[PDB]
Scaffold this active site. Structure first.
Site, PDB file in Angstrom:
ATOM      1  N   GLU A 299      -3.096  -2.630  -5.089  1.00 62.36           N
ATOM      2  CA  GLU A 299      -3.984  -3.783  -5.081  1.00 62.36           C
ATOM      3  C   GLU A 299      -3.683  -4.798  -6.191  1.00 62.36           C
ATOM      4  O   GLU A 299      -3.812  -6.010  -5.983  1.00 62.36           O
ATOM      5  CB  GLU A 299      -5.440  -3.324  -5.174  1.00 62.36           C
ATOM      6  CG  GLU A 299      -6.409  -4.374  -4.692  1.00 62.36           C
ATOM      7  CD  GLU A 299      -6.257  -4.668  -3.211  1.00 62.36           C
ATOM      8  OE1 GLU A 299      -6.355  -5.851  -2.835  1.00 62.36           O
ATOM      9  OE2 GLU A 299      -6.054  -3.722  -2.419  1.00 62.36           O
TER      10      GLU A 299
ATOM     11  N   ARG B  30      -0.615  -6.814  -4.969  1.00 59.53           N
ATOM     12  CA  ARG B  30      -0.977  -7.711  -3.865  1.00 59.53           C
ATOM     13  C   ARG B  30      -1.688  -8.946  -4.398  1.00 59.53           C
ATOM     14  O   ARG B  30      -1.328 -10.075  -4.061  1.00 59.53           O
ATOM     15  CB  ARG B  30      -1.914  -7.023  -2.866  1.00 59.53           C
ATOM     16  CG  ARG B  30      -1.256  -6.083  -1.880  1.00 59.53           C
ATOM     17  CD  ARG B  30      -2.306  -5.440  -0.976  1.00 59.53           C
ATOM     18  NE  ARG B  30      -2.952  -6.404  -0.088  1.00 59.53           N
ATOM     19  CZ  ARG B  30      -2.397  -6.896   1.016  1.00 59.53           C
ATOM     20  NH1 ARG B  30      -1.177  -6.514   1.377  1.00 59.53           N
ATOM     21  NH2 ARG B  30      -3.058  -7.768   1.764  1.00 59.53           N
TER      22      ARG B  30
ATOM     23  N   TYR C  22       0.773  -1.239   0.000  1.00 64.34           N
ATOM     24  CA  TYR C  22       0.000   0.000   0.000  1.00 64.34           C
ATOM     25  C   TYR C  22       0.809   1.297   0.000  1.00 64.34           C
ATOM     26  O   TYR C  22       1.977   1.326   0.399  1.00 64.34           O
ATOM     27  CB  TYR C  22      -0.993  -0.011   1.168  1.00 64.34           C
ATOM     28  CG  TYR C  22      -2.113  -1.001   0.952  1.00 64.34           C
ATOM     29  CD1 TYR C  22      -2.958  -0.887  -0.155  1.00 64.34           C
ATOM     30  CD2 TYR C  22      -2.313  -2.074   1.823  1.00 64.34           C
ATOM     31  CE1 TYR C  22      -3.970  -1.814  -0.394  1.00 64.34           C
ATOM     32  CE2 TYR C  22      -3.331  -3.015   1.593  1.00 64.34           C
ATOM     33  CZ  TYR C  22      -4.152  -2.875   0.483  1.00 64.34           C
ATOM     34  OH  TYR C  22      -5.155  -3.788   0.240  1.00 64.34           O
TER      35      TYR C  22
ATOM     36  N   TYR D 228      -9.132   2.459   2.414  1.00 58.22           N
ATOM     37  CA  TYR D 228     -10.287   2.591   1.533  1.00 58.22           C
ATOM     38  C   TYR D 228     -11.502   3.272   2.161  1.00 58.22           C
ATOM     39  O   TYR D 228     -12.105   4.147   1.542  1.00 58.22           O
ATOM     40  CB  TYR D 228     -10.684   1.217   0.987  1.00 58.22           C
ATOM     41  CG  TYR D 228      -9.690   0.629  -0.002  1.00 58.22           C
ATOM     42  CD1 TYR D 228      -9.444   1.247  -1.230  1.00 58.22           C
ATOM     43  CD2 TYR D 228      -9.031  -0.571   0.273  1.00 58.22           C
ATOM     44  CE1 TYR D 228      -8.574   0.683  -2.163  1.00 58.22           C
ATOM     45  CE2 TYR D 228      -8.156  -1.143  -0.650  1.00 58.22           C
ATOM     46  CZ  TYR D 228      -7.933  -0.513  -1.868  1.00 58.22           C
ATOM     47  OH  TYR D 228      -7.083  -1.093  -2.789  1.00 58.22           O
TER      48      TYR D 228
END
EC number: 3.2.2.22
Length: 173
Positions: free
Chosen positions: A162, A165, A65, A108
């Site tokens: 994302e 990941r 992140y 988020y």
């Protein structure tokens, strides 16, 4: 820290995929995060678009992140969750003139709330990312409103953090 580059100018599925693979290859997903020396805790991602504007995102190697970013002579950081990260981020963009840490985090839920009305179902793609890069850059000079900045963070996070990941996890079946 190792630097990975990517541009939206003339972007193809292949250039985007090699970009994400490069990020995934520098990751070391772990439960906690003070378990790594600050000298190898971050990965820098330099983004540039068609207008030749460029911003550098700082990614945490333990979860992928975004913890903050740099645009020209200014740097911004999400509110750190603890002391390791707090002092850790002081080791990023040390040569930058202006430094600022938001009072809010980069998760988020917070971003969605800040995006308010502006974004109900954020569209992703090369075009949205192109515009997101400009939004992050101009924020440092007063041309980007908060809801727009939030929407832009979400686009960068979903298309980069994302994406990396997801591939990392599917790698370890």
């Amino acid at each position: 820290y190792p630097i990975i580059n990517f541009t939206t100018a003339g972007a193809t599925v292949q250039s985007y995929t090699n970009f994400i693979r490069a990020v995934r290859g520098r990751l070391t997903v772990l439960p906690n995060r003070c378990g790594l020396p600050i000298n190898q805790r971050f990965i820098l991602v330099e983004l540039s678009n068609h207008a030749e504007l460029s911003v550098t995102l700082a990614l945490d190697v333990t979860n992928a992140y975004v913890v903050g970013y740099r645009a020209g002579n200014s740097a911004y950081f999400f509110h750190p969750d603890n002391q390791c990260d707090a002092e850790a981020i002081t080791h990023l963009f040390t040569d930058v003139q202006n430094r600022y840490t938001f009072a809010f985090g980069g998760n988020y839920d917070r971003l969605e709330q800040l995006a308010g009305n502006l974004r109900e179902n954020i569209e992703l793609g090369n075009g949205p990312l192109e515009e997101a890069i400009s939004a992050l850059y101009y924020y440092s000079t007063g041309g980007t409103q908060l809801p727009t900045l939030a929407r832009s963070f979400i686009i960068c996070i979903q298309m980069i953090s994302e994406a990396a990941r997801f591939q990392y996890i599917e790698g370890e079946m």
